[PDB]
Amino acid sequence: MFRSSFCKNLENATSHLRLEPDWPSILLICDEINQKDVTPKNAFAAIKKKMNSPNPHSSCYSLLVLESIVKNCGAPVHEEVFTKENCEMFSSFLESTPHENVRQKMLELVQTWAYAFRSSDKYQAIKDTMTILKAKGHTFPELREMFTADTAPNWADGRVCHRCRVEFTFTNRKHHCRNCGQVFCGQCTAKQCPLPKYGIEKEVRVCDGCFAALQRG
């Protein structure tokens, strides 16, 4: 039964009822692994079962959970995850799933991971799985990028607005964008939005460049 806190958070995070990711539960999962409440092995096995959920949304969401722990939980997770069998499993998985949305997300992760651990000795079964998949006829998504954990960038300072370069005065003062951490004038940071991946659910101040980029990805 719900028993471990981890399992309740995974149920929550992979629930077909959510219309957008449940970042709060996903961030809780990352902390539980990082703090040793649950082992990388047990987490990954529970994740696999959710990957095999008959629901397309639950199945794809579990892939998002997977992307997050690989990104936020370090070597303990990387070693559990990127093995020969698992990379091959990832392969058969994406090749036989009835949901294309699921297959596309897995293809993207394989490639993201191939480039992320490109300079790492320990991992490469990933780079090859892509070789075989790119050789087997599978087409990969557009590349976007190692990766940095889900954490708000540090906040820079400066004497001019990063975007428009206007010089700050005592009246036209600086403001930080919560997504990139740079300083901007108020007119270049007049919009706001949530940054749930950084644990921020409320709408906070962001710069124009970030508001545009967030609107895309």
Residues that bind a second copy (CB under 8 A): 24, 27-28, 30-31, 34-35, 72, 149-152, 154-157, 169-171, 173-174, 176, 181, 198-199
Instruction: Please name the helix (run of DSSP H) or strand (run of DSSP E) that holds residue 185, with its range, or none.
Output: none
> Phi and psi of 195, rounded to 5°?
-135, 70
Contacts of Zn ion in 22-81 (CB under 5 A): none
Q: Which is nearer to a second copy, 119 or 171 (CB)?
A: 171
**Is 188 an interacting residue with respect to Zn ion (CB under 5 A)?**
yes
Consult the annotation and say whether 210 binds a ligand: yes
180 labeled part of a ligand binding site? yes
Specify the amino acid at residue 50: K
Query: Which of 143, 156, 164, 213 is close enough to bind Zn ion by CB under 5 A?
Result: 164
The distance from CA 146 to its chain's CA centroid, rounded to whole angstroms, is: 13
Yes or no: say if 35 and 43 are a contact pair by the CB < 8 Å rule: no
**Residues 193, 205 contacting (CB under 8 angstroms):** no
Identity of the residue, 84 or 173, whose beta carbon is nearer to a second copy in the bound complex: 173
Lookup: tokens for 181: 């951490």
User: What SS3 class is residue 150?
Assistant: coil
Q: Name which of Zn ion, a second copy, none residue 66 binds, using a CB cut-off of 5 to 8 Å depending on partner kind.
A: none
Binding site for Zn ion (CB under 5 A): 161, 163-164, 177, 179-180, 185, 188, 207, 210
